RNA sequence: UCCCCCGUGCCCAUAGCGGCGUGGAACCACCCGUUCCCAUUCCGAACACGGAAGUGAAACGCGCCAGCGCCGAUGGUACUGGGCGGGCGACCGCCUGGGAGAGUAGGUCGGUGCGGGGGA
RNA sequence: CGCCUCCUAAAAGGUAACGGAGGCGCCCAAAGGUCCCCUCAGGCGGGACGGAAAUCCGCCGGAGAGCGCAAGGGUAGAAGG
RNA sequence: CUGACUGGGGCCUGUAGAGCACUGAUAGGGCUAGGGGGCCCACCAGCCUACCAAACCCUGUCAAACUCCGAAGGGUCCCAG
């Protein structure tokens, strides 16, 4: 979909003051503009948990302007697991690199056999027109056993969208599951002591 | 990847420029020979001479020698006397050597 | 530059067929021979009798050129090898002696090889050069059974200006190199 | 590598020398020197060069020798070992081939005795 | 210095005075060192020869 | 259980434990994570008890990701000796863990399965913990 | 070339057994060889020195058809 | 003073790798030779000399391209001089001044000094 | 138990513990002076005996080789050959 | 009048933090020599692996004796209080 988010301008307000008033600080940029912004945290969080660098967010500004952006970067407070700053990338008419959600259709035969589908990439990096952004990219994984894998070279891309990663990059795999029957093997598995790399006259 | 040519040139010339004298640089093409006296502190050439610019005759070795005399005569009229010879990538031999001998005959001190 | 039949065959016959087979637009683009490097990795003379001068007297008769000593890079215990030890001969043939050697090589030497069935078509550099080894040195017309003492072969590198294996296959085959496949 | 690729001994008679070739025995030595009219008692050191290539020519063109003979004998042992017949099995194991007893002897085919 | 790497003196062969002390490896260099050196008595260069220290 | 196969040095100084975790603060592999809420040296024994507790709750199925590794040698002098006479002997290995670090992630399993396995695992560790689920914030990292 | 180290190359005859003679260069002015490219069976087409055999076995027997049909 | 080339410096990859294209009148190179100077642990490959039929194929120079490499903000954060608080501790905060690294936007297929030859 | 190298050492210098790791008590007549020349390890392909690795050839390869010996600094525009 | 301390200016530095380009460590996946095992075989090859796994790549990390980076400060000289 196409989400909307009120944004506001900030000059010399201190980020800790804005964040204490419930406002997430941010920035807007492309080759033409660079402006210090802030959004409302609860408002931004409602949108971002859905939009999430994948779908377009339109920023309604206080001067009346509206600008179509991709979230380019989210900085998290490593202690509290909270966003502390956003980068809004203002889209132009030229193509753009971006991540399109991968969507894994079907149940693998390995998963039926007891396995686990490891979704290695959940989106994929890609150049596409900002008027061409597909909602997702379907991938058939129903023929993967334990342990087969899928790569970006197996992506059936919609029209207008070019792969921006190496075709040899792994996107999914189906791996063996955890098994209690292996525990007693691993428990009674003696692992020898670490070797210390020879130093000096002995090497 | 430097060539043996570029290594030879750098090696010869670093040693020359360490002594702080004006260098007599010499470029030897298949056809012609050239000379500049260079102040490396200013990065500036003070006096030149070459077969191409004097439209000189046939035998490359005697041509080289005459180029040296020519360089000397113009050098002394500017006050230049002492100098350091910059064989660059060439052996001190033949055409280069002749140009050096020709410079010395003209009173360049080296 | 001497008049040698192989060199003349290169210019008169070989070059025209190469220009026609590949359509070169510059005369310097047509494949030619750069050098022929002969190597004896003797090593059976390391310490024993470093009187490989026997072999140097041989290669000098074969090529008209005095080969030069190869010395061991590092020391190798299993090969019984001390760094710096003399372990063979390399002689680099260019211009008329290169032609003069290759001339006798194709006419006389290769035919005298035991159970000869043609040069190995797959021995090409991947960049347009070729290599072949020899099992003996009596193969050559100058080295007679009388003068010989031991059976010493060699490596032969044939370096061309061709950028690809196909152009080099063309040039060598045209000069008279007998390939089996 | 005179004839034929084997540098046959000088000092010895021609019939005797040519036996030092894979494929030429006492029988074919008589055949080569008659068919080229060479005294069979002449030492190899005394063959006129005309005689040599005369002797060389007939020998190499008439009979399979050295490598071609050896490749052929091998090719026959190979095909016997591929078509899986009984003689082929005996060549597969290195055992004798012409029906001999193996409880004892057969040391030529088996090699020197292996202890137990 | 050791048993095989000995100390030694260099003696000016013209005036016989010992002008330099040095060392060598008498296994590697069993012959007596002959070297040109300045002799300050003769006030010129001179063949000096190894002499026991 | 986990420990380096080789090392350049047998014994490490103790260092400090200040600050939030350096990296590894977002869910990178599985669907749910167990986040450290306070610093500690987590022992190789503790990680293995945490891993076994999750394997046993899953019985058969699922995938566990262990995102910390005990590479720091832990040293203790022999009992009843005095101070001095050199550094103690290596008795074990620990992983340094600071607040915000995602220690374990699980995948291939229901939400109720993951919540409960990460809870039992957390009871084996010498620190308070949080259970998290992969977010858009995790994906944008 | 350096002096006094290289064997001098002079014009040379090479006489093969097949009468072929090559005008080349060598350290020896006249050499006799037993074979050359002009007569070697690999060179001179499919000159099968002897075994122009074909199959040869395992059917050119045909001794005979006397068994019935 | 403008454009091309040859020397020779400076900045120190925004200057590099790769791909493609282009240049021989001039210059440069390959080139033609190995008598002469000089030269090869063998080799005129190199070094060197004497040349001038050819070719810009190689090299070099000059363009174009952002796949790699190189450079890289703004914003925010870590950390912190100095000043204060809190916690039994491991450790955690506030003020004031300073402020990265990673990453994002983006930049880059160089710029410039001196002399020499040619051109307009 | 003297001496050298690194760390501890809190970005000048210095800095302790029966703190963490290694080395020295030699050597070289060239392994020294100077002049001239040369450039590595490694990867791939090719080559008789010949091999993971001997010697040869081609392409890639800025320094990961080398520098008598510990470690560190330095270093091919050489301190290496 | 040169001092502690302070202003400005230059130069020196490798810590905090961070990073992974070097030296090592490292979980998983991919790719993939070599082993384990399984069909098939001895006639020398061939296929298969939910096995261990080098190199390489991706994702994600660790380091007093790691550093492609790198502060705050500190040191020192000049002029001024
Ligand atoms: N220059 C400074 N403000 N330094 C503050 C040091 C950190 C301090 N202990 C804090 O977390 O608050
Ligand atoms: Mg919230
Ligand atoms: Mg040592
Ligand atoms: Mg030509
Ligand atoms: Mg090939
Ligand atoms: Mg080639
Ligand atoms: Mg012969
Ligand atoms: Mg016989
Ligand atoms: Mg019987
Ligand atoms: Mg029987
Ligand atoms: Mg401590
Ligand atoms: Mg503990
Ligand atoms: Mg402890
Ligand atoms: Mg202690
Ligand atoms: Mg202890
Ligand atoms: Mg422990
Ligand atoms: Mg942590
Ligand atoms: Mg707990
Ligand atoms: Mg990251
Ligand atoms: Mg000479
Ligand atoms: Mg001479
Ligand atoms: Mg230029
Ligand atoms: Mg300048
Ligand atoms: Mg390209
Ligand atoms: Mg070009
Ligand atoms: Mg021209
Ligand atoms: Mg023209
Ligand atoms: Mg001469
Ligand atoms: Mg003359
Ligand atoms: Mg030449
Ligand atoms: Mg030249
Ligand atoms: Mg000419
Ligand atoms: Mg060109
Ligand atoms: Mg062109
Ligand atoms: Mg050049
Ligand atoms: Mg552009
Ligand atoms: Mg920089
Ligand atoms: Mg950056
Ligand atoms: Mg900033
Ligand atoms: Mg403080
Ligand atoms: Mg405290
Ligand atoms: Mg602050
Ligand atoms: Mg501030
Ligand atoms: Mg910093
Ligand atoms: Mg930055
Ligand atoms: Mg560029
Ligand atoms: Mg310039
Ligand atoms: Mg100019
Ligand atoms: Mg001009
Ligand atoms: Mg210190
Ligand atoms: Mg220190
Ligand atoms: Mg210090
Ligand atoms: Mg002091
Ligand atoms: Mg003590
Ligand atoms: Mg000791
Ligand atoms: Mg010496
Ligand atoms: Mg190599
Ligand atoms: Mg190889
Ligand atoms: Mg082999
Ligand atoms: Mg090899
Ligand atoms: Mg080194
Ligand atoms: Mg005062
Ligand atoms: Mg004072
Ligand atoms: Mg001050
Ligand atoms: Mg740190
Ligand atoms: Mg690393
Ligand atoms: Mg990285
Ligand atoms: Mg740390
Ligand atoms: Mg760290
Ligand atoms: Mg440290
Ligand atoms: Mg550090
Ligand atoms: Mg970078
Ligand atoms: Mg930087
Ligand atoms: Mg500072
Ligand atoms: Mg300090
Ligand atoms: Mg200061
Ligand atoms: Mg002070
Ligand atoms: Mg200051
Ligand atoms: Mg004052
Ligand atoms: Zn005296
Ligand atoms: Zn013939």
User: Domains plus CATH for chain F?
Assistant: 29-137 (3.90.1170.10)
Nearest-angstrom CA–CA distance, B45 and B68: 16
User: For residue D60, what is the domain's CATH number?
Assistant: 1.10.8.50
Asked whether residue D77's C-beta has any atom of DNA/RNA strand J within 7 A, the reply is: no
CB G56 within 8 A of CB D75: no
Mark residues 12-41 of chain C whose C-beta is closer than 7 A to nucleic acid strand H. Answer: 26-29, 35
Nucleotides of I under 7 A from a protein CB: 8, 17-24, 26-30, 36-39, 41, 45-59, 61-63, 69-71, 76-78
* DSSP 8-class letter at A154: G
Question: How would you class B27 by CB atoms within 10 Å of its CB: exposed for 0-12, middle for 13-18, buried for 19 or more?
Answer: middle
CB A58 within 8 A of CB A67: yes
Looking at the fold, whether D6 and D51 belong to one and the same domain comes out as: yes
- G25 has binding-site annotation: no
Looking at the fold, whether D62 and D16 belong to one and the same domain comes out as: yes
Q: Is the peptide bond before A147 cis (omega within 30 degrees of 0)?
A: yes
Nearest-angstrom CA–CA distance, B72 and B59: 20
Question: How would you class A117 by CB atoms within 10 Å of its CB: exposed for 0-12, middle for 13-18, buried for 19 or more?
Answer: buried
Looking at the fold, whether D61 and D82 belong to one and the same domain comes out as: no
Distance set, CA B94 to CA B33, B56, B98, D106, F34 (Å): 12, 17, 6, 83, 81
Rounded to a whole number, what is the largest CA-CA distance in chain E? 34
Provide the H-helix boundaries in chain F.
44-58, 111-122, 136-140
Asked whether residue A20's C-beta has any atom of DNA/RNA strand I within 7 A, the reply is: no
Provide the H-helix boundaries in C80-122.
95-104, 110-112
Other Cβ atoms within 10 Å of C146 Cβ, number: 5
Beta bridge partners of A97: A127
Order of all β-strands in the sheet with A170-175: A116-119, A170-175, A149-151
CB C156 within 8 A of CB C37: yes
Looking at the fold, whether D6 and D48 belong to one and the same domain comes out as: yes
Looking at the fold, whether D1 and D56 belong to one and the same domain comes out as: yes
Mark residues 33-62 of chain B whose C-beta is closer than 7 A to nucleic acid strand H. Answer: 34, 36, 38, 40, 43-45, 48, 50, 52-53, 58-61
Evaluate whether chains D and E are touching (3 or more beta carbon pairs less than 8 Å apart).
no
Nearest-angstrom CA–CA distance, A187 and A184: 5
Nearest-angstrom CA–CA distance, D27 and D29: 5
Looking at the fold, whether D78 and D45 belong to one and the same domain comes out as: no
Method: X-ray
3-state helix, strand, coil in chain D (%, to 5): 55, 5, 45
Looking at the fold, whether D56 and D26 belong to one and the same domain comes out as: yes
Looking at the fold, whether D18 and D62 belong to one and the same domain comes out as: yes
Residue D101 makes CB contacts below 8 A (sequence gap 6+) with none
Number of domains in chain D: 2
Residue A76 makes CB contacts below 8 A (sequence gap 6+) with A82, A83, A84, F25, F26, F137, F141
CA distance G47 to chain D (A): 10
Nearest-ligand number for the alpha carbon of F78: 15
What secondary structure, in 3-state letters, does D31-45 show? HHHHHCCCCCCCEHH
Asked whether residue C95's C-beta has any atom of DNA/RNA strand H within 7 A, the reply is: yes
* DSSP 8-class letter at C146: T
Looking at the fold, whether D62 and D35 belong to one and the same domain comes out as: yes
Q: Resolution in Å, one decimal, please.
A: 2.3
Domain coverage including residue D76:
72-116
Distance set, CA E32 to CA B70, E26, E29 (Å): 56, 9, 8
Whether the CA torsion E28, E31, E32, E38 is positive or negative: it is negative
User: For residue D86, what is the domain's CATH number?
Assistant: 4.10.910.10
Looking at the fold, whether D65 and D85 belong to one and the same domain comes out as: no
The domains found in chain C, sorted by start residue, are 2-181 (3.30.1440.10)
Place of tokens 């290289």: G6
Looking at the fold, whether D13 and D61 belong to one and the same domain comes out as: yes
H-helix or E-strand spanning residue B102: helix B94-105
Whether the CA torsion C151, C152, C158, C164 is positive or negative: it is positive
Looking at the fold, whether D4 and D51 belong to one and the same domain comes out as: yes
């Amino acid at each position: 979909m196409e989400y909307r988010l009120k944004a506001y301008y900030r000059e010399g307000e201190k980020p800790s003051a804005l964040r204490r008033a419930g406002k997430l600080p941010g920035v807007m940029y492309n080759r033409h503009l660079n402006r210090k912004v802030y959004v409302d945290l609860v408002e931004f969080d409602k949108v971002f948990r859905q939009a999430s660098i994948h779908h377009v967010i339109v920023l309604e500004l206080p001067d009346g302007q509206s600008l179509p952006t991709l979230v380019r970067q989210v900085n998290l407070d490593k202690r509290r697991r909270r966003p502390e700053h956003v980068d809004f990338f203002v889209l132009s008419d030229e193509p753009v690199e971006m991540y399109v959600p991968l969507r894994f259709v079907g149940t693998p035969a390995g998963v039926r056999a007891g396995g686990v589908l490891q979704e290695i990439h959940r989106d994929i990096l890609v150049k596409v027109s900002p008027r061409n952004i597909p909602e997702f990219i379907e991938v058939d994984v129903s023929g993967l056993e334990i342990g087969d894998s899928l790569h970006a070279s197996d992506l059936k891309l919609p029209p207008g969208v070019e792969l921006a990663v190496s075709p040899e990059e792994t996107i999914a795999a189906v791996v063996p599951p955890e098994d209690v029957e292996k525990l007693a093997e691993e428990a009674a598995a003696e692992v020898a002591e670490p070797e210390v790399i020879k130093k000096g006259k002995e090497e | 990847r430097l060539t043996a040519y570029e290594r030879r040139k750098f090696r010869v010339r670093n040693r020359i420029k360490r002594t702080g004298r004006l260098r007599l640089s010499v470029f030897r093409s298949l056809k012609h020979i050239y000379a500049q006296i260079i102040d490396d502190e200013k990065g500036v050439t003070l006096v030149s001479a070459s077969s191409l610019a004097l439209k000189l005759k046939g035998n490359k070795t005697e041509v080289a020698r005459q180029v040296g005399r020519a360089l000397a005569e113009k050098a002394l009229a500017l006050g230049i006397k002492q100098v350091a010879f910059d064989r660059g990538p060439y052996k001190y031999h033949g055409r280069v050597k002749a140009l050096a001998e020709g410079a010395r005959e003209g009173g360049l001190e080296f | 530059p001497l008049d040698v039949a192989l060199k003349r065959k290169y210019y008169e016959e070989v070059r025209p067929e190469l220009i026609r087979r590949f359509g070169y637009q510059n005369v310097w683009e047509v494949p030619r021979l750069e050098k022929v490097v002969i190597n004896q990795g003797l090593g059976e003379a390391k310490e024993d009798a470093r009187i490989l001068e026997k072999a140097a007297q041989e290669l000098a008769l074969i090529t008209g050129q005095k080969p030069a000593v190869t010395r061991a890079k590092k020391s190798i215990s299993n090969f019984k090898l001390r760094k710096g030890m003399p372990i063979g001969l390399r002689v680099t043939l260019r211009r008329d002696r290169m032609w003069i050697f290759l001339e006798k090589l194709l006419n006389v030497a290769l035919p005298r090889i035991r159970d000869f069935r043609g040069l190995n078509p797959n021995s090409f550099d991947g960049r347009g050069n070729y290599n072949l080894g020899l099992r003996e040195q009596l193969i050559f017309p100058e080295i007679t059974y009388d003068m010989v003492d031991a059976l010493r072969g060699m490596d032969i590198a044939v370096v061309t200006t061709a950028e690809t294996d196909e152009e080099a296959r063309a040039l060598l085959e045209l000069l008279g190199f007998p390939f089996r496949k | 590598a005179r004839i034929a690729g084997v540098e046959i001994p000088r000092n010895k008679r021609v019939d005797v020398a040519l036996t030092y070739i894979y494929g030429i025995g006492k029988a074919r030595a008589k055949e080569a020197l008659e068919k080229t009219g060479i005294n069979p008692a002449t030492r190899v050191k005394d063959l006129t060069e005309a005689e040599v290539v005369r002797l060389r020519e007939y020998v190499e063109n008439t009979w399979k020798l050295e490598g071609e003979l050896r490749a052929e004998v091998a090719a026959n042992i190979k095909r016997l070992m591929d078509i899986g017949c009984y003689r082929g099995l005996r060549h597969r194991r290195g055992l004798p081939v012409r029906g001999q007893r193996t409880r004892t002897n057969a040391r030529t085919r088996k090699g020197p005795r292996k202890t137990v | 210095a050791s048993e095989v790497r000995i100390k030694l003196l260099l003696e000016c062969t013209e005036c016989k005075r010992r002008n330099y002390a040095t060392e060598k490896n008498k296994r590697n260099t069993p012959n007596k060192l002959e070297l040109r050196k300045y002799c300050p008595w003769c006030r010129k260069h001179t063949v000096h020869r190894e002499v026991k220290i | 259980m986990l420990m380096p196969r080789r090392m350049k040095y047998r014994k490490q100084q103790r260092g400090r434990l200040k600050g939030a975790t350096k990296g590894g603060d977002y869910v990178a592999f599985g669907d749910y994570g167990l986040v450290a809420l306070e610093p500690a040296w987590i022992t190789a024994q503790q990680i293995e008890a945490a891993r076994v507790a999750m394997v046993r709750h899953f019985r058969r199925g699922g995938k566990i990701f262990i995102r910390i590794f005990p590479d720091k040698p832990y040293t203790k002098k022999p009992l009843e000796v005095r101070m001095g006479k050199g550094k103690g002997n290596v008795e074990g290995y620990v992983a340094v863990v600071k607040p915000g670090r995602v220690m374990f992630e699980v995948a291939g399993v229901t939400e109720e399965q993951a919540m409960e396995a990460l809870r039992i695992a957390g009871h084996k560790l010498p620190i308070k913990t949080k259970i998290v689920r992969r977010d858009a914030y995790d994906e944008a990292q | 070339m350096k002096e006094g180290i290289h064997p001098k190359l002079v014009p040379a005859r090479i006489i093969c057994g097949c009468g072929n003679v090559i005008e080349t260069y060598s350290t020896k002015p006249e050499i006799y060889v037993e074979v050359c490219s002009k007569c070697h069976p690999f060179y001179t087409g499919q000159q099968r020195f002897v075994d122009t055999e074909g199959r040869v076995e395992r059917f050119q027997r045909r001794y005979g058809d006397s068994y019935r049909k």
